[PDB]
Design a protein around this ligand. Structure first.
Ligand SMILES: O=c1ccn([C@@H]2O[C@H](COP(=O)(O)OP(=O)(O)O)[C@@H](O)[C@H]2O)c(=O)[nH]1
Ligand SMILES: O=c1ccn([C@@H]2O[C@H](COP(=O)(O)OP(=O)(O)O)[C@@H](O)[C@H]2O)c(=O)[nH]1
Ligand SMILES: Nc1nc(=O)c2ncn([C@H]3C[C@H](O)[C@@H](CO)O3)c2[nH]1
Ligand SMILES: Nc1nc(=O)c2ncn([C@H]3C[C@H](O)[C@@H](CO)O3)c2[nH]1
Lengths: 208, 218
């Protein structure tokens, strides 16, 4: 199985994109971000607790988000392509890093998280090894507008500064490079105008 | 390699006991609790053990997940690294992923130190880790070092760890209840119970006789 992660800022359009991919081919499945589990752990909405009080709940969320990704991705392993919606890499190097820099995690929480992540990666790194990255790139302002379209209750307080931080981390990782990466511009609505992206995706997969 | 965990209340004498067993035989190795790591957080700074006792409604979940991770890591490392030269090898775990969950974490949830959400996430985390790494660490026996809450309290006082000084008798009683029902009443694997209310630092010969007789059946 060729393993491809779809990376991007919040509301870039990853769920929308991967839904279109799903249907294109019998040989391609998708492992979605398990967001429904994060909003209902009846249960506690930990996604929400993290947004309301990141200093209190970030580590608990991050821990669980990461665990939930690895479970889903390990479980999905059983011309086949598997598209991962995000990855253990963006878990740590985009999101968790940003929480620490932001003082949402303290040094202790951040050490504990990395220790855990290091270890998971040792044990499961070979199997969750990515063959490529599809980067859906949209300006912070576009992602901000898409947050208010989608209208999740948890995400309504999100500062543009937060999105900018996440964006910059994506750019520096995936674009500035400071693994084969295809970068797709998703600033313009693509929900119908997607034919070019798919050919580009198809052409990327064949280089691998 | 027979795997035996040593269970008991806080300051029942597991470290002391484990230090003795370590030295009695070449085929007997121990995996201590990583309390050094919990006291100064670093990867293979912060005192999470202390944070957990000063503010458990804030730090309980963080401690529990870390403690459990560090335990599995320690046990797994000794499994692969120790006892290559032994004829009847036995690896003694100071505590286990079972007491983490069924004594300590359970008790913190029960005491409202973890909320429902924290408790769910921990159980999820614990189930996955146990599935992934559980068959390697499965126990062949438990040695239960039984000491009264009163005795454990005064040993906490004797050992004098700063972090532990605010620990109420009430708290040790709950932990003791959980051990009794888990290991004795079987209302919560071969179990050897050893009464350690009297000092055994220099009268351990017949505790040890008991351990050897216990191991033979396994
Ligand atoms: O071309 C697009 C792509 C996305 N969206 C909307 O933008 C929001 C976020 O897209 P998605 O959930 O796929 O984002 P993700 O967070 O998964 O990247 C949703 O309201 C989509 O319906 C849109 O209107 N046009
Ligand atoms: O027979 C004993 C067993 C223990 N202790 C003391 O009681 C404290 C708690 O023992 P230990 O640290 O081994 O307990 P743990 O928390 O590991 O159970 C330490 O001061 C020990 O020196 C003792 O005086 N005599
Ligand atoms: N803090 C935090 N850490 C992560 O690793 C992470 N991965 C995804 N998310 C957020 C983005 C969307 O709001 C929503 C679904 O993508 O949850 C995360 N938030
Ligand atoms: N909350 C909590 N959960 C655990 O799983 C746990 N395991 C050990 N301990 C505490 C008791 C002793 O102080 C000390 C040394 O064993 O650490 C724990 N405390």
């Amino acid at each position: 199985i060729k393993k491809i992660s779809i990376e991007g800022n919040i509301a870039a359009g990853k769920s929308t994109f991967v839904n279109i991919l799903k249907q294109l081919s019998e040989d391609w499945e998708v492992v979605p971000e398990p967001v429904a589990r994060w909003s209902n752990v009846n249960g506690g909405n930990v996604l929400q607790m993290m947004y309301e009080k990141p200093e209190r709940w970030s580590f608990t969320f991050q821990t669980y988000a990461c665990l939930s990704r690895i479970r889903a991705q390990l479980a999905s392993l059983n011309k086949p392509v598997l598209f991962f919606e995000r990855s253990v890499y963006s878990d740590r190097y985009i999101f968790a890093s940003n929480l620490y820099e932001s003082e949402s995690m303290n040094e202790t929480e951040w050490t504990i998280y990395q220790d855990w992540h290091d270890w998971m990666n040792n044990q499961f790194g070979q199997s969750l090894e990515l063959d490529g990255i599809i980067y859906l790139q949209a300006t912070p302002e576009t992602c901000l507008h898409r947050i208010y379209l989608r209208g999740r209750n948890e995400e309504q307080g999100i500062p543009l500064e937060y999105l900018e931080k996440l964006h910059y981390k994506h750019e520096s990782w995936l674009l500035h490079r400071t693994v084969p990466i295809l970068t797709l511009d998703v600033n313009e609505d693509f929900k119908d105008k997607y034919e070019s992206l798919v050919e580009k995706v198809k052409e990327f997969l064949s280089t691998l």
